Amino acid sequence: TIYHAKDAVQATKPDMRKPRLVVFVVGETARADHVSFNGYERDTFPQLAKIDGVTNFSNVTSCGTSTAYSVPCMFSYLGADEYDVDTAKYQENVLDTLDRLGVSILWRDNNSDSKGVMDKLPKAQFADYKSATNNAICNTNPYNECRDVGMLVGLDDFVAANNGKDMLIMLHQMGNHGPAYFKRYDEKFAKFTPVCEGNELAKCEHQSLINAYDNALLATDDFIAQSIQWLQTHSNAYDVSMLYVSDHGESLGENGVYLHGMPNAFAPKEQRSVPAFFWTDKQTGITPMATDTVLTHDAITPTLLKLFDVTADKVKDRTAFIR
């Protein structure tokens, strides 16, 4: 294990002040420019629009163009310039630090796995919500595809079992995964029709392909808002905040390019400009950076430390999503 944060101290503790409860949604395939807040032609986020104290960040570049590449980078101390995917698995990452500091770290996954981020942590601190042995909300579509809202079912137990600790809950959603965008949302979220239902994106009508993708954003909107909504039911006991960042974006036909994963060298901006949202309770004292701050995945690790009153030298100079 290669540490970078052995100096990390937590300056105030949950026995001498309100314990902190944060949800970090790790998003999937979402594009900054199909967010309404960023100027999109469609209301892709009606519910987030209704919630007080949410910051939309109009300028976020992802560490890379794939799940296996950006998710480790998202939790790394090295930053996108010194980051190396291939040894990432055995660096100390920010969840290692907070867990060492006694913050209770949970990872629920309706996507794949943590792409190595949870590896040094006890198996039990990770749960597979793609399967119905965990996800109560799989039966809501003709595909039986388990849903991200399911990852909220039961979080109250756990908060029960961790009563009086600091908690960082990572929800790794299926989000906007392709090719089969149409499969990602329940019929309630089918605002835009007709829709691509083919596996050969390209042979589809661009508009129909745009349409499935935006329906899949509406569901993500419903998940994120339900995520804040669950936090709110704990605001008088815990300092609650919610961080959402996508791992990468998506090419939807631009220059005959689709899906993602193109090497950062020659990658279209579509695969790298990602949305980021931050919500907090007014009682917490947290303050967001300006909406328009030019930010990258490198802001996540310092945000996570600041959320828990934890300083660490390798990122004391790093711009976070919050002051």
Given the rule CB under 5 A, which residues bind Au ion?
Answer: 28, 67, 247
Nearer to Au ion, 10 or 296 (CB): 296
Minimum CB–partner distance for residue 69 and Au ion (Å): 9
Closest by CA position to 321, among listed 115, 74, 84, 49? 74
Instruction: Please give the structure tokens belonging to residue 158.
Output: 């756990």
Dist. CA 33–CA 36, nearest whole Å: 8
Minimum CB–partner distance for residue 238 and Au ion (Å): 30
* 119 annotated to a ligand binding site: no
The values of phi and psi at residue 310, to 5°, are -120, 120
Measured in whole angstroms, the distance separating CA 139 from the mean position of its chain's CA atoms is 24
In DSSP terms, 278 is beta-bridged to 55, 243
* 28 annotated to a ligand binding site: yes
The CB-side HSE value for 90 (13 A sphere, CA atoms) comes to 4
Minimum CB–partner distance for residue 247 and Au ion (Å): 4
Nearer to Au ion, 28 or 148 (CB): 28
For residue 33, the tally of other CB atoms under 10 A from its CB is: 14
Nearer to Au ion, 67 or 97 (CB): 67
The CB-nearest residue to Au ion is 67
Minimum CB–partner distance for residue 181 and Au ion (Å): 13
Nearer to Au ion, 5 or 88 (CB): 88
Nearer to Au ion, 89 or 323 (CB): 89
* 177 annotated to a ligand binding site: no
Minimum CB–partner distance for residue 248 and Au ion (Å): 5
Q: What is the largest CA-CA distance in the chain?
A: 60
Beta-strand relationship, 104-109 and 310-311: unpaired
* 247 annotated to a ligand binding site: yes
Q: Which residue in the block uniquely carries the two structure tokens 């949870």?
A: 118
Residue numbering of the annotated binding site: 28, 67, 247-248
Residue numbering of the annotated binding site for Zn(2+): 28, 67, 247-248
